[PDB]
Amino acid sequence: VKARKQEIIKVTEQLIEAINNGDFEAYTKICDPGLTAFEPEALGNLVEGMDFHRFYFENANKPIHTIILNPHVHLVGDDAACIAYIRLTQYMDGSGMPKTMQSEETRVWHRRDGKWQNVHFHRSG
Amino acid sequence: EDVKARKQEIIKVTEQLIEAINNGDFEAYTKICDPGLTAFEPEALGNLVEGMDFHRFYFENANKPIHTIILNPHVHLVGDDAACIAYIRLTQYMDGSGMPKTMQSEETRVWHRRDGKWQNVHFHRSG
Amino acid sequence: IEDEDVKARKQEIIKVTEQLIEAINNGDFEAYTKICDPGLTAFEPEALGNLVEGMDFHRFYFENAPIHTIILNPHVHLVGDDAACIAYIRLTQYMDGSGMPKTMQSEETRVWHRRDGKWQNVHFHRSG
Amino acid sequence: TTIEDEDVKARKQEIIKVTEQLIEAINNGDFEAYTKICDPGLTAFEPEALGNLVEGMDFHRFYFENAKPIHTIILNPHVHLVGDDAACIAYIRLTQYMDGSGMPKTMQSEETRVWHRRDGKWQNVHFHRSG
Amino acid sequence: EDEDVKARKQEIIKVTEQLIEAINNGDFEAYTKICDPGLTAFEPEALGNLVEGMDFHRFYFENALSNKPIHTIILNPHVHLVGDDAACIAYIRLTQYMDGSGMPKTMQSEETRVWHRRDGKWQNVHFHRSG
Amino acid sequence: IEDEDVKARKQEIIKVTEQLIEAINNGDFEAYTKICDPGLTAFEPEALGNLVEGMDFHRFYFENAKPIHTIILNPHVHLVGDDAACIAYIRLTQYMDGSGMPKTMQSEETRVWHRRDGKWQNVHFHRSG
Amino acid sequence: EDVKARKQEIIKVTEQLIEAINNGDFEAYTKICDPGLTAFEPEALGNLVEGMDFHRFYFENAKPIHTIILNPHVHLVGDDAACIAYIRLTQYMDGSGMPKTMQSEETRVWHRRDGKWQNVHFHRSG
Amino acid sequence: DVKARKQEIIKVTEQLIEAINNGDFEAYTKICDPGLTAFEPEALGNLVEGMDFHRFYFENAKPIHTIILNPHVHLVGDDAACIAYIRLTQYMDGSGMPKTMQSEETRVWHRRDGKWQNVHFHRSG
Amino acid sequence: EDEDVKARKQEIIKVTEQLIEAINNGDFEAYTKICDPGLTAFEPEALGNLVEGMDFHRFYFENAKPIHTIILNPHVHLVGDDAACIAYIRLTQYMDGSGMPKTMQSEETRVWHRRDGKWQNVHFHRSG
Amino acid sequence: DVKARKQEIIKVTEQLIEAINNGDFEAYTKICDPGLTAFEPEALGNLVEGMDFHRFYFENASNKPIHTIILNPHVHLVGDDAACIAYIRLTQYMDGSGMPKTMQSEETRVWHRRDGKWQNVHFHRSG
Amino acid sequence: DVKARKQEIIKVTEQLIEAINNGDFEAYTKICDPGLTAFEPEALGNLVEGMDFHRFYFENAKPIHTIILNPHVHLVGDDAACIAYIRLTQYMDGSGMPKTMQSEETRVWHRRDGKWQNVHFHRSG
Amino acid sequence: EDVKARKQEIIKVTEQLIEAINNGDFEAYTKICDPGLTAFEPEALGNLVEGMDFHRFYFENANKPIHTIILNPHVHLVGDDAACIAYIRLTQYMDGSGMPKTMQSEETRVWHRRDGKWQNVHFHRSG
Amino acid sequence: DEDVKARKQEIIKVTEQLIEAINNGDFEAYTKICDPGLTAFEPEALGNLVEGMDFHRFYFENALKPIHTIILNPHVHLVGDDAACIAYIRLTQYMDGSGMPKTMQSEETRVWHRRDGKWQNVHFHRSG
Amino acid sequence: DEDVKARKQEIIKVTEQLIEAINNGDFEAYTKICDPGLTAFEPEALGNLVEGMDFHRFYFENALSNKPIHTIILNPHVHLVGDDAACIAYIRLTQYMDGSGMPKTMQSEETRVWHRRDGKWQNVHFHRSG
Secondary structure: OOHHHHHHHHHHHHHHHHHHHHOOOHHHHHEEEEEEEEHHOOOOOOEOOOOOHHHHOOOOOOOOOEEEEEEEEEEEOEEEEEEEEEEEEEEEOOOEEEEEEEEEEEEEEEEEEOOEEEEEEEEEE | OOHHHHHHHHHHHHHHHHHHHHHHOOOHHHHHHHEEEEOOOOOOOOOEEEEOHHHHHHHOOOOOEEEEEEEEEEEEEOOEEOOOOOEEEEEEEEEEOOEEEEEEEEEEEEEEEEEEOEEEEEEEEOO | OOOOHHHHHHHHHHHHHHHHHHHEEEEEEHHHHEEEEEEEEEHHHHHHOOEOOOOOHHHHHHHHHEEEEEEEEEEEEEOOOEEEEEEEEEEEEEEEEOOEEEEEEEEEEEEEEEEOEEEEEEEEEEEE | OHHHHHHHHHHHHHHHHHHHHHHHHHHHHHHHHHHHHHHEEEEEEEHHOOOOOEOHHHHHHHHHOOOOEEEEEEEEEEEOOOOEEEEEEEEEEEEEEEEEOOOEEEEEEEEEEEEEOOEEEEEEEEEEEEO | OOOHHHHHHHHHHHHHHHHHHHHHHHHHHHHHHEEEEEOOOEHHHHHHEEEEOHHHHHHOOOOOOOOOEEEEEEEEEEEEOOOOOEEEEEEEEEEEEOOOOOOOOEEEEEEEEEEEEEOEEEEEEEEEOOO | OHHHHHHHHHHHHHHHHHHHHHHHHHHHHHHHHEEEEEEEEEEEEHHOOOEEEHHHHHHHHHOOOOOOOOEEEEEEEEEOOOEEEEEEEEEEEEOOOOOOEEEEEEEEEEEEEEEOOOOEEEEEEEEEE | OOHHHHHHHHHHHHHHHHHHHHOOOOOHHHHHHEEEEEEOOOOOOOEEEEEEEEEEHHHOOOOEEEEEEEEEEEEEEOOOEEEEEEEEEEEOOOOOEEEEEEEEEEEEEEEEEEEEEEEEEEEOOO | HHHHHHHHHHHHHHHHHHHHHHHHHHHHHHEEEEEEEEEOOHHOOEEOOOHHHHHHHHHHHHOOOEEEEEEEEOOOOEEEEEEEEEEEEEEEEOOOOOEEEOOOOOOOEEEOOEEEEEEEEEEEO | HHHHHHHHHHHHHHHHHHHHHHHHHOOOOHHHHHEEEEEEEEEHEEEEEEEEEEEEHHHHHHOOEEEEEEEEEEEEEEEEOEEEEEEEEEEEEEEEOOOOOEEEEEEEEEEEEOOEEEEEEEEEEEEE | OOOHHHHHHHHHHHHHHHHHHOOHHHHHHHEEEEEEEEEEEOOOOOEEOOOHHHHHHHHOOOOOOEEEEEEEEEEEOOOOOOOEEEEEEEEEEOOOOOEEEEEEEEEEEEOOOOOOEEEEEEEEEEE | OHHHHHHHHHHHHHHHHHHHOOOOOOOOOOOOEEEEEOHHHOOOOEEOOHHHHHHHHHOOOOOOOEEEEEEEEEEEOOOEEEEEEEEEEEEEOOOOOOEEEEEEEEEEEEEEEEEEEEEEEEEEE | OOHHHHHHHHHHHHHHHHHHHHHHHHHHHHHHEEEEEEEHHHOOOOOOOEEOOHHHHHHHHHOOOEEEEEHHHHEEEEEOEEEEEEEEEEEEEEEOOOOEEEEEEEEEEEEEEEEOEEEEEEEEEEE | OOHHHHHHHHHHHHHHHHHHHHHOHHHHHHHHHEEEEEEOOHHHOOOOEOOHHHHHHHEEEEEEEEOOOEEEEOOOOOOOOOOEEEEEEEEEEOOOOOEEEEEEEEEEEEEEEEEOOEEEEEEEEEOO | OOOHHHHHHHHHHHHHHHHHHHHHHHHHHHHHHHHEEEEEOOOOOOOEEOOOOOOOHHHHOOOOOOOEEEEEEEEEEEEEEOEEEEEEEEEEEEEEEOOOOOOOEEEEEEEEEEEEEEEEEEEEEEEEEO
């Protein structure tokens, strides 16, 4: 159970590494094509598919560090998991200085032909 | 036919959960939730809460009619015994000034079928 | 020759919109239901940015809530024989908390469809 | 029964497709294209019209003539088919754009459009946008 | 000749005074006799819209039933005679009234009224008040 | 028959009002003067609550003031005898702002018109913000 | 003597006028004011008002009070005309129960008809 | 007769304002009684006397137009009048644009040796 | 030498204390005996104007919770045999609306003139 | 003799203010008693004594004109060698925005004549 | 072992908070070292020492539930531990309604004669 | 006497720790902290953070003089290899306006001795 | 070292007794512990230095509800055999309008002088 | 009061020297006049009592900035508390030049306690409040 849970934390880390690298091919590989999301940038709408996130990758030398804090993982049958965590982001600001911000994040994962894939997520500030 | 019907099952169970909440029926809420339920919600102030302890206080200590609408639900079937559902939760209620108002929340619920009965294992509400 | 009917057909839509508003102001949900398509979709300030569908959402307002409405400057488009839409400023005259008469306004669009001879509202969009 | 569902699914796509073409004309600043897709007696409610119902193309022309990548998403569209030659469509219009601070932002509008088919080509006869 | 003009202008001032008196007395019947049935108005209460007919004003008469005294002064009126059966009048309308705190206050409005003589009786066809 | 005519007479007033505004937007005081009665009275925001009389007041604005479009919205015209009319409309102005961008503003506007020697002339107006 | 005394006459009549006002005696006020009095005052909201109509409402529809005419300057402008400029201090009791003072700049123009001085114009500003 | 005598006062008031707008202190001095008294916003609530106070404004202070609006003139004996009017000033602002402002203004006039002179004035914003 | 200056200065402080005591007691007759009939004053209640005589103050006595005054840090100048002035912070201890004790302060100058053996206040200036 | 004696005090007060406006500390020092006491807004509620406090203002405060008007002065003669004067002090000056402005103060000055020359022993200014 | 030893500290921290919520000063005193030092919002930025300061609260102060959230315990030798956790308090508000609030809280524990005792604590809002 | 010197030991090590932070020296800081250090601090926004990951970013991405004062330190000795220390941390620093300024924090640190070296196992800063 | 320590305790003890006098509202006790020429800086004196007992009396007489004071982190200097000063944070725990317990604080300095065996407060400085 | 007046001047003089050391940014001089165990209350210490010289050094070392300053000790009251001890309380006016280029005054209430060691008066404690 502990190692299976690690698997989900590992894949969630890989996903976030994709986002911080600004790598949409990597992000597209890890997400189900019909991924749905709630997030602050969606302004209260449920968005669906990759269309919406693309714009953020395409139009995004400043260092960033993410911390997945206090992750709790439920295994929900053999090919299904979800993971809930605080996402700390450390970044550099306009005043030139280091700063941290946070988000609550839920992600639901589904395993297709051996690869885990993100089918939904919910971020809130 | 089948995917449509399986999805309805999740919407139906989500509707029953909300109805337990709106009726303040903790016993019913308990039956529908996994005992190790984890939650993110505004009232938990940024923390992930675990189990039933936290919610009990709300039931125990909270005539004004109320209506909930599950709006625009999207359901993912994630294997035979697992689903999640995402929707806008509209709540219609009566305000202090005596008048009807609506508010909203984004809400995600993850569901797991144990012994034939679907159960909520996690949820995430945001204002 | 050809206008006589256009003017009259347009009045039909203004008249039916006036009946709808009168149902609302009378709090007559049964009447409102008869005039609305059961799959009515709405944009409105109370729905907080969401598109709502059906009657569920409006029922609450009827069940749990003098006044004059003016349909101002209505423009009607006839869009085939069994379809129209109407756009107007909806003035509402009402009495305020301080005891006094006040007017407020909304921009409002309604789309109408004629089924079995009776016009019915299929969609509306109100903005403050 | 069954067969009407598909009929209806395709007809509705036709409206979504045409609405997509309209928005693309707008985002491209192509007034000629916009003009071909709009009925000449188009009526509009929109924030820029400050509470008034505007009529015709006069009012919009100024925006095209006198106005940083952009993406629009038609979100959650609902289409009503209102007889053979008439439809309306209601959706959230998300716009992704680049801000003054150099950064990507999203904004939204509720939008209703009423469509009428003349000589085989769908045309926009009315719209209502609210912030 | 200057006498003729002076008297004709007084007629308009007099009729405007009667109208305002009707309004202050809350006499809708009187107000209706003095106004053309297709009266158009611009006023603060109409929130930027041009209102037409009597419908809009009726609500104010029917539901503003207010004991407390009021005096109106038509200040600095200018009258244009625009043909034999038409005039307009422009003036500052001072209203003296009693306030919530119990005390006397004065407020003002700029006001334009256009008058048309039908069957010997002058009638108000349009007005424009601004705060 | 009788409605087409009222319709045409009303257009005449809308046309002349459009010509006036065009004179204003072009800053053509001579044209403005020809269209206004020399004893024009005005209420307007720039007059700060006072009724101004004649051309003196407006001249300063012409003499001392990017693209502009005016729309006369929802005009209602009353015909008040053969030689007299008034018109009430929302005046939308589209213009370019300090930030470089296109903006619209509005005013409620009433104009009273008198026909002298065949030519309609503005005898009074009232604009409010 | 002569100039000093003539000036006092104007200050005295101004004092009588203010006293009429403070007593709410409209008949007295009317006797002292020319029927075509013109006024600028804060209650007239920026407009010049004419005649007695406007002031009547205040008398008809309006706790001790004291007025002080402070630092009056009088110009004698021919035999039958003067004007007087002064700060008008008003001492009064407030809502909170307490004594307060307020002030106004005030100009009055006076004309003598049939031996009796009358106020033809005034200008008060806060 | 009354109409003409009144015009005389309006004309002289117009000449005074023109002196002011031209910044011509000599002219202003010829038109004002040397013991002129004034109430005005710049005098901050005090009654000022003589020319001293105004001189500073002329000496140390862009087209301008004044309009004497709605003047009422009282004739107060043969050698005395007062005039009350709204003084509209049209001017150019900091932002480059034309603006109007207003003042209530009272002036009292006295005729000495045939020439009308200003003995008092009261301006309020 | 300084014993006599010290004593003369006390005389002015003593008379100032008597004046304030008259004021706090609301004794206008006393106040009138201690003040020159042509007293001039600057004070916050006179709103920026210099007031003259007794008229202005009378209203306060006639129409106006224990109180204590402290004359703090007084400096006295002896300006000839029959003239002095005194400058001090005037602390007032009083009871407030909320029922509680509060202190407030004023800067205060008083000029004194001796007529027929009795010191009299000819001018004062208070500022908040 | 009263009118003339009073003028003497107004004249000397005018000289003092002129010394101030010229920034002439030596002049100011000659006209002031060395034990001058003052109340003024810049002294923040404290009574200041001597010349120390004022010196800083002279030493560190240009090419922008100024006019003072002693308005409505009242002078009390308080014995042969003592007077006080109370007036509104109007100051006309040029502001940051480039324009002429007037400001005011209530001002009291007490004067004492030593060896034939009047000297200021105390003053009180309030805004 | 480590899991059980840590529980012992969580259990004792739970007993302390229960003493507080019951307003049982005698119980609180038994669990605290007499030389307890504290940082807390009510001490206004000062480090308080002993029981004097807290006694006033017990003596002079509606259901309530506390949750010790996400506790981390360090075992620092055999007779010493510290515990850090989010303290959630559920309570009833003035408006009649249930509310939750939170505090970050650190406690340092020392075992004397077999009984664990609180020697220091730090709460921050 | 003994107790006083053992207490000094903890104050000394806390001073060394803070010197490390102000020098921006992460190797020094890593030496003095237990690898499983937990912290509460304002920058962690209300979360309890664990290990060195979080603080690294602040060292790597941070010539302005700084002085820290450990004020009124109280130290408890909690068995032979365990201590904690609680103090006000005054930081004197230079601001944007170019000027010297002081700020403060309440700080708690728990210390554990492993093979002779004292190591910080937890800390809690609050503003 | 027990001596310096105990002499310092003496000053803390007397400072406690002084504050107990204040909280008991006992002006005779307070007057006994203060030198008659005591000077003070305190918020209620609004930025002036006050002198003697006059000023404080008003507060005792008109201060007519449990309170607890804590002298926190006192530092005491002994400044010759009959002189000391003490500096401390004065925490006050009290009950508020909303009915609830609250704490407030002040920085406080007191200078003490021994006259015929009794220590007496000659000066103090409180600031918020 | 011949000796009392003079003894009090001694304390006012030494306070004036201290302030002059401060205004000159002379830490060595400040150090000679202060007891090494000086305790202070002051606004910059944010509510804490600070001890020793450590805290004040930073201000001297890092506050330079041809910009004149005058201090006035106003209305000083001095208590003589035995032969080797005094305290002094006064309003400290500071005249200085502001950002806008202009002269301004500010004030503080200030108490200082003095102790004579080996003939030289030294400051053992002070309390400033805004």
